[PDB]
Amino acid sequence: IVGGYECKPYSQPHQVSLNSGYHFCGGSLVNENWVVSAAHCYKSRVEVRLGEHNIKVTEGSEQFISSSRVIRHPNYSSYNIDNDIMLIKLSKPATLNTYVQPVALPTSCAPAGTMCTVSGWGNTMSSTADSNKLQCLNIPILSYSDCNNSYPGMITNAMFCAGYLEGGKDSCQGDSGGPVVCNGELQGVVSWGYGCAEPGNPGVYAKVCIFNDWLTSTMASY
Ligand SMILES: [NH3+]CCc1ccccc1
Ligand SMILES: [Ca+2]
Known part of the structure; x- marks a missing residue:
């Protein structure tokens, strides 16, 4: 993280x-x-x-x-x-x-703009953050349009983007398979992306609902 x-x-x-x-x-x-x-x-x-x-x-x-x-x-x-x-x-x-x-399975599909939490023991790219201790981060769900614009033609019905287009905050290698929880329910699973925390390349997650x-x-x- x-x-x-x-x-x-x-x-x-x-x-x-x-x-x-x-x-x-x-x-x-x-x-x-x-x-x-x-x-x-x-x-x-x-x-x-x-x-x-x-x-x-x-x-x-x-x-x-x-x-x-x-x-x-x-x-x-x-x-x-x-x-x-x-x-x-x-x-x-x-x-x-x-x-x-x-954790509870989804009672609905969360809309764009919802704030969620992602966690894991992956790469931190920091000189002060210890990846051996569980890390947490709050990220917002992005619209389909912004997600497809970042990765043209590669976004399917089973995916959603979450994070910041400016870069700096994201999940990374080692966090794969982990949770994305919103309103107390499991909405996503850490899947893929181009690099970690790079501007213009937000994280992609499997759409559990x-x-x-x-x-x-x-x-x-x-
Ligand atoms: N946000 C990118 C997460 C990620 C990056 C590299 C391999 C697996 C998962
Ligand atoms: Ca232990």
Whole structure:
């Protein structure tokens, strides 16, 4: 996260770290048995780490649980990184407490201008900000016109831009798969962009609200 601030410990209890010998992507807990992330973060098996603030230090609030199923969206495509969403089933249910709590799925699609929060353990491009400690940032959703103008012909029905055209504040490498929360609901998943925090190149996110039918039908299986 570039241009943000350190989150108050455990203020984003749905945030998770995906690990395969080291941290490589983020994710969000949506209920006791399922996690939502990005299709581009796919691996056949991964370890999900919940209840974290500093990923390099044992705090006593953590839960480490292996996956039993990793499901990428059936229509994912690398040409334009379309349909960048994935579901992960936990091998045993998570214990909900002061440190671990799920985030609600969308009751609507958020309109342009809405302020949201994005978080993660990715690159900070700062000499004072420690990426080992969870970082937070507030960003506004941009209009379709401004999003398409920045990336001509590359924006599909499953994407939205959020951030600042002036540059300076944005999500970055390592934040992939993480949450974008607006009005208390999960509206986006960190997906792609050209560089990080560059003027004229805002971040692009997967649009969760249009995937509701696939998400609910898929979770109805155990
Ligand atoms: N806002 C850009 C986020 C991003 C950048 C590079 C790789 C993956 C995700
Ligand atoms: Ca820790």
